[PDB]
Design a protein around this nucleic acid. Structure first.
Ligand SMILES: NC(=O)c1ccc[n+]([C@@H]2O[C@H](COP(=O)([O-])OP(=O)(O)OC[C@H]3O[C@@H](n4cnc5c(N)ncnc54)[C@H](O)[C@@H]3O)[C@@H](O)[C@H]2O)c1
Lengths: 573, 469
DNA sequence: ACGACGTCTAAGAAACCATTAT
RNA sequence: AUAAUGGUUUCUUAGACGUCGU
């Protein structure tokens, strides 16, 4: 029942980390690209079943169960299935096990780099493992530039002496129960070397505390060594910590080992920290005295900003016409009113609503205005104002992209210039601007084309009227106008719409609007957009540009050079 | 000028059916060739059971009798094909329930109908459904009918009956199909038949179809959020994640709770470095555990919001140092809509085309931004006319609307991203139309977040595909 | 430095209506 | 909730500036 918490196994490792040893496994290498024992087991079992889909796992598992194979997840499948598939072919067995555990992907992850870094500085001294790959060696060599001292079954005979000469760091690869064959069939005294390496583990575990990650308990000699180490007096003085991805799949053999350690008396817990990379990253977070060079190698540095080059113009003809009109103007001149005492945007808006000025205003670090001097002198008494100058706005695209207030200000200057000296109305709904058609003057020739675009079967249509089931409501044809900055350029977005006269009473005409725009398909929408563009900008499609002026007879006006042709593209080749 | 570079079109993805035959039309392919799972006989049969009041049981039975007989489409006849019956399209019989699989909740139904009960209704329903906890090898999918009176309990400023029922039923390992009064109406029987038969086959354990272009080394992840709105002065936010294959199955997902849910109560949908790293590490672990320890060479991550400074670095620190990572944000609202203009044909000048822009068109706007349509004219799927396009959203909008992609990482081109998104659009088995507006990653992340939101405890577990579909 | 509240724009989830593919 | 997703009404979030006090 004594099981530690995720957070409780992070302050203990923070306090004392020098008296800690590790026992890695296959799972710790899984994120590096090398499949674990279970992945090979399913591969061999599928190979015995004869790119194949993994969606038939249950059927082949049931067919395994029918014959009487040991069990699923039982610590017997590895050797059994290896022998069954490869018979007695030793060379083929080596060829297979050297191809799926080769330096193929062998790509390092965050956990391996963190462990190599902790091996660099004198934080972790001895690391044991059952793997026979080069993930830890490669990470240590990359981070440090030196070579680790690896002791395995190739004539080491130095591990136990190394602990005494304190020759850290000490990485000891152990054979276990199945590396290439079984441990039984190694005649040339290689079992004595394994016994010596295991005997070194007793002295190693006498002083240190153990943290086992990525191990399942498959082997038998490893478990016997762990039990023998536990049998030693005051073994693991700092305790034993077995970290698992989840308790629900916590390896009853591992649970039995934890129970035995608790029974004999050992600070042993069954900790759950998720994956290996997660635990190693969280451990790396709370580390003191980190060298500057190491931190660059451990965590991934800043990634370069994304930049995909834009193609050129196209030549195919199923063309695409958008609804955005380019804006060429990039330099305008506005006014600045230096004040004796600074104000806020809310107070400026309230004062604007107080007396109606024939000018536009907005507030930044300095207050900007467009219009006439007497207008601002009406909105601002002569006592408070000191001097009135000018404020250049070069490259309006970047200023609009960066600053938000300038966006709204330029949008309103542009629309005031557009709707000026024209019969079109001006309405606002949720900060969006519209160009509604007046009911009184919806009969002259300037709107005639629009009528032709809203008719049926060549007949003329109506651009203003009253809602059918409403004796108070009325409706007109409008268009929403927006200003958008994209790619360092300014576009005006146009979208035809229908305006209802009482703004608060628009939910009573939803069905009328939906019926009105139901068959406004590609051709009708094309014609409606063309008619609206002709209405707003005067010149019909195909014209280059038209200049629009805001407050033309004023000291601080606004001239714009909006383009009439809408943005389009052609297909490649 | 006003030249928007050059656009390209992604060809309509092909779907794979029984005996590796390819077709772009899902229903037509299912009618001619059959489901993908029929090759190896994955679901042996589809057995149903009922859970509804007796006064409303008969009508439920009626729908089953309609699921094994043909039907003809009365609406949307340009796309929908004739339904042939369950043991003619899916090659597997639809088995009716027996006497012992006709559970009832008679005394407990009309009382909550006349009342406004919330949680107690759901837990009582689940308790009634728990009476068959042992004999769970008698059916594959359950058909549950919530009457038009239970509408009051259905939901009121928060708690959702369907979501909570699905949440309580997921640990019990039994798929559920809920039938309301809408499925027994609409005057177009073929639509309902095609929508329910495919769902029942998928929930039974089948794979109705698959993507034909499956031989790529890629994987796809989606992240979405949902507002919890507890009855207080705060506003919680919850997120989820999934993994998909180039063939587009993705049968599992990780339901992880961001950090220690004791004194956090996050207020914005933005993960920190550690939380993003933990989520992505667990997702990679699940994908490796499902595919025999195989690591993809390239990863696509889709999100509805932008990627902050911590999120990008956490994403880059969850996979290997040799796996290409491409992070994309998908924006559903845009100021562009675009029109189609046909070229000069034989003695015919350029003019606006009749049907709208093609579905797979994509337009580059900025060195990191693109417009993808995923909605528009589609060729080759019309039933009546052989050479006339199909616009699926013609009853709602005259014109299609694009989406935007921001592409916070990567170095490749737009073609791979657009192709992956367009292919992922077409593999939703809960949807009976031709495609969707968004890829299945975002859709499934949203639905998983919506289900996970209505839960008092942490629930750090890995659930199944069909349990929420 | 940095805590409060204003302002602006961009974008999305919740919840309730609506109609069915030239 | 067989589905598709368009509207309407509210609600937030993020970023960017401002004033005050600390
Ligand atoms: N890389 C190798 O050297 C290698 C590879 C395959 C097999 N083997 C052989 O397997 C035999 C037994 O070793 P084993 O017990 O480790 O095999 P195993 O497959 O049973 O170990 C897997 C264990 O690690 C956990 N795990 C899986 N993924 C993880 C992750 N991403 N992070 C943290 N933990 C994760 C699993 O839950 C499991 O408990 C060894 O003798 C060894 O020779 C070795």
């Amino acid at each position: 029942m004594d099981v530690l918490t995720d957070n409780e196994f992070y302050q203990h490792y923070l306090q004392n980390s020098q008296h800690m040893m590790w026992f890695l496994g296959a799972g710790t290498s899984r994120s590096a690209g090398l499949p674990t024992a279970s992945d090979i087991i399913w591969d061999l079992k599928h190979r015995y079943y004869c790119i194949n889909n993994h969606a038939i796992k249950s059927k082949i598992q049931s067919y395994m169960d029918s014959k009487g194979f040991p069990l699923q997840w039982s610590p017997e499948e590895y050797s059994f299935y290896f022998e069954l598939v490869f018979r007695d072919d030793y060379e083929a067995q080596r060829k297979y096990l050297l191809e799926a555990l080769a330096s193929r992907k062998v790509s390092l992850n965050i956990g391996h780099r963190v462990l190599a870094a902790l091996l660099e500085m004198n934080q972790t001294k001895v690391v044991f493992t059952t793997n026979f790959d080069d993930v830890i060696e490669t990470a240590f060599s990359d981070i440090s530039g030196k070579h680790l001292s690896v002791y395995h079954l190739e004539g080491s005979y130095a591990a136990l002496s190394a602990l005494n000469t304190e020759a850290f760091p000490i990485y000891a690869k152990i054979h276990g129960d199945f590396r290439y064959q079984k441990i039984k069939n190694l005649t040339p005294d290689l079992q004595t070397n394994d016994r010596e390496i295991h005997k070194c583990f007793l002295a190693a575990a006498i002083r240190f505390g153990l943290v086992v990650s990525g191990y399942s308990g498959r082997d038998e000699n490893v478990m016997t060594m762990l039990r023998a180490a536990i049998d030693q007096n005051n073994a693991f003085p700092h305790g034993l910590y077995w970290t698992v991805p989840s308790i629900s799949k916590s390896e009853p053999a591992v649970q039995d080992l934890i129970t035995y350690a608790q029974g004999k008396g050992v600070r042993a817990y069954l900790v759950e920290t998720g994956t290996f990379d997660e635990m190693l990253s969280k451990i790396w977070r709370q580390v003191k005295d980190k060298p500057a060079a190491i931190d660059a190698k451990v965590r991934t540095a800043r990634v370069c900003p994304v930049s995909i080059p834009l193609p050129g113009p196209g030549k195919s003809f199923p063309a695409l016409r958008t609804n955005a009109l380019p804006v060429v103007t990039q330099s305008i001149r506005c006014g600045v009113v230096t004040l004796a005492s600074p104000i806020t945007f809310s107070e400026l808006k309230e004062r604007i609503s107080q007396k109606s000025p024939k000018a536009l205003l907005t507030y930044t670090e300095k207050v900007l205005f467009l219009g006439g001097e007497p207008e601002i002198r009406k909105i601002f008494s002569n006592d408070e104002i000191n001097s009135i100058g000018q404020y250049y706005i070069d490259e309006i695209a970047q200023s609009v992209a960066a600053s938000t207030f300038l966006k709204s200000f330029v949008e309103e200057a542009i629309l005031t210039a557009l709707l000026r000296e024209k019969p079109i109305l001006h309405r606002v709904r949720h900060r969006t601007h519209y160009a509604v058609i007046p009911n009184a003057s919806a009969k002259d020739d300037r709107f005639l084309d629009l009528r032709k675009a809203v008719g049926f079967k060549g007949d003329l249509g109506y651009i203003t009227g009253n809602v059918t089931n409403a004796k108070e409501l009325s409706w007109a044809e409008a268009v929403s106008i927006r200003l958008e900055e994209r790619g360092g350029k300014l576009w005006i977005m146009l979208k035809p719409e229908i305006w209802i006269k009482p703004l608060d009473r628009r939910e009573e005409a939803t069905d009328f609007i939906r019926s009105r725009r139901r068959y406004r398909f590609n051709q009708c929408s094309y014609q409606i957009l063309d008619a609206w563009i002709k209405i707003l900008f005067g010149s019909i499609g195909g014209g280059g540009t038209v200049n629009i002026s805001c407050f033309p007879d004023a000291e601080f006006k606004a001239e714009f050079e909006i383009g009439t042709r809408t943005a389009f593209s052609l297909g490649v080749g | 000028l006003s030249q928007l570079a050059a656009h390209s079109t992604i060809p309509e993805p092909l779907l794979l059916f029984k005996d590796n035959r390819t077709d772009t039309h899902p229903l037509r392919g299912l009618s001619q060739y059959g489901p993908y799972s029929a090759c190896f006989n994955l679901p042996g049969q589809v057995r149903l059971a009922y859970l509804a009041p007796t006064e409303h049981m008969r009508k439920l039975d009626a729908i089953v009798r309609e699921l094994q007989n043909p039907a003809t489409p009365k609406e949307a006849t340009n796309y929908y094909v004739e339904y042939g019956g369950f043991e003619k399209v899916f090659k597997v019989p639809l088995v009716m329930p027996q006497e012992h699989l006709r559970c009832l909740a008679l005394d407990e139904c009309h009382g909550v109908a006349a009342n406004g009960n919330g949680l107690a209704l759901a837990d009582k329903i689940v308790q009634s459904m728990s009476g068959l906890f042992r004999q769970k090898h008698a059916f594959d999918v359950l058909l549950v009918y919530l009457p038009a009176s239970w509408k009051k309990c259905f939901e009121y400023d928060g708690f959702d009956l369907h979501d909570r029922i699905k949440a309580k039923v997921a640990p019990l390992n039994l798929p559920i199909q809920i039938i309301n009064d809408t499925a027994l109406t609409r005057q177009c029987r073929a639509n309902v038949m095609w929508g329910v038969s495919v769902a029942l086959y998928a929930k039974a354990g089948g794979i109705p179809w698959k993507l034909a272009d499956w031989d790529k080394d890629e994987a796809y992840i989606g992240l979405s959020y949902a507002i919890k709105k507890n009855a207080e002065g705060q506003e919680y936010t919850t997120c989820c994640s999934q993994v998909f294959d180039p063939d587009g199955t993705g049968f599992e997902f990780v339901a992880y709770d961001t950090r220690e849910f004791i004194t956090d109560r996050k207020g914005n949908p933005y993960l920190s470095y550690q939380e993003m790293q933990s989520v992505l590490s667990k997702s990679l672990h699940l994908y490796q555990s499902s595919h025999n320890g195989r690591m993809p060479r390239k990863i696509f991550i889709h999100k509805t919001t932008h990627f902050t400074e911590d999120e990008i670095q956490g994403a880059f620190d969850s996979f290997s140092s040799s796996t290409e990572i491409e992070l994309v944000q998908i924006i559903q609202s845009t100021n562009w809509y675009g029109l189609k203009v046909d070229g000069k044909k034989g003695d015919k000048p350029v003019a606006p085309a009749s049907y709208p822009v093609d579905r797979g068109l994509y337009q580059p706007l900025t060195e990191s931004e693109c417009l993808l349509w995923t909605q528009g004219s589609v060729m080759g799927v019309n039933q009546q006319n052989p050479g006339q396009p199909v616009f699926k959203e013609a009853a709602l909008t005259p014109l299609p609307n694009p989406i935007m992609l921001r592409r916070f990482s990567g170095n490749g081109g737009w073609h791979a991203t657009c192709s992956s998104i367009l292919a992922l659009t077409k593999v939703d088995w809960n949807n009976n139309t031709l495609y969707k507006k968004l890829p299945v990653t975002l859709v499934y992340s949203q639905v998983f977040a919506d289900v996970v939101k209505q839960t008092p405890e942490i629930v750090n577990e890995i659930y199944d595909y069909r349990f929420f579909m």
